[PDB]
């Protein structure tokens, strides 16, 4: 920053529509299929979205398709609090403006666990008071916060660029903070805030999964993409063979 700053806010992906059909009555088909729709047409802003981001073309082709393969959801989500919080604080999962979650909807989406700890990450937006900058920063940081076990192909530029966004987070701390103990004491909260994520995305990995297993049997719709990264990237998380990269133990 003001380089940094300028650039996560500039590549902020604009407003995404489900396409959702708010006038029939509500299902466990229509609801999740919306999801999965919604999921995909986000994927392609994500994607666009990290490949814009400062340093990200340092990592191997391979690696910048996996760190957005895995951390997709968490991705998602982290951006679905933020707006739930903004725009009808926190009362609804503001999926979309065409895709907004009552408790109705949470209850027949078969998912309402789900939504109540995501619902609960949005109420910690404003709980702890986060900044625009605060959270676009934390964001970019979780693009680079889950990797396989065994490393990616040229993990060093992922340490350096996985460490650069850590510093930038720092700064935006700083830059706000007379105090060196007020500093200390939101870096903890926000690591704290972004470790909370990975625990609502597994559950979210092992739900989808489940869902994409017996999707025929529920008449749910799974788009393209959606389908081949929940049934080849996923399962290594869910097998262990991927894990997110906590700050606290
Ligand atoms: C070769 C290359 C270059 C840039 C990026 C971001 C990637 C990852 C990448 N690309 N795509 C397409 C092109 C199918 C939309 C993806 N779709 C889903 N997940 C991905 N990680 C990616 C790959
Ligand atoms: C990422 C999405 C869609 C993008 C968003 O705003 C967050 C939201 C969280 C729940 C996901 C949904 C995509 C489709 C999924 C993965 C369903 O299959 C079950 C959980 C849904
Ligand atoms: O700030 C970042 O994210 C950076 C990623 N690569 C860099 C190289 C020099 C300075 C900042 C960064």
Not at 126 to 138: A, R, S, Y
Not at 214 to 233: N, R, T
């Amino acid at each position: 920053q003001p380089i940094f700053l300028n650039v996560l806010e500039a590549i902020e992906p604009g407003v995404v529509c489900a396409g959702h059909d708010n006038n029939q009555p509500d299902s466990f088909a229509a609801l999740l299929s919306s999801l999965n729709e919604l999921g995909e047409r986000q994927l392609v802003h994500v994607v666009k979205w990290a490949k814009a981001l400062p340093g990200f073309r340092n990592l191997h082709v391979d690696d910048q398709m996996a760190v957005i393969q895995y951390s997709w959801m968490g991705l998602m989500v982290f951006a679905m609090g933020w707006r739930s919080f903004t725009n009808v604080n926190s009362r609804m999962l503001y999926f979309a403006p065409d895709l907004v979650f009552n408790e109705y909807r949470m209850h027949k989406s078969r998912m309402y666990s789900q939504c109540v700890r995501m619902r609960h990450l949005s109420q910690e937006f404003g709980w702890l008071q986060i900044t625009p900058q605060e959270f676009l920063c934390m964001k970019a940081l979780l693009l680079f916060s889950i990797i396989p076990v065994d490393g990616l192909k040229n993990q060093k530029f992922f340490d350096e660029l996985r460490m650069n966004y850590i510093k930038e987070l720092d700064r935006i701390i700083a830059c706000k903070r007379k105090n060196p103990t007020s500093c200390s004491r939101r870096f903890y909260q926000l690591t704290k805030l972004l470790d909370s994520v990975q625990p609502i995305a597994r559950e979210l990995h092992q739900f989808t999964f489940d869902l994409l297993i017996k999707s025929h049997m529920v008449s749910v719709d799974f788009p393209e993409m959606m389908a081949e990264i929940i049934s080849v990237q996923v399962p290594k998380i869910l097998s262990g063979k991927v894990k997110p990269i906590y700050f606290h133990t």
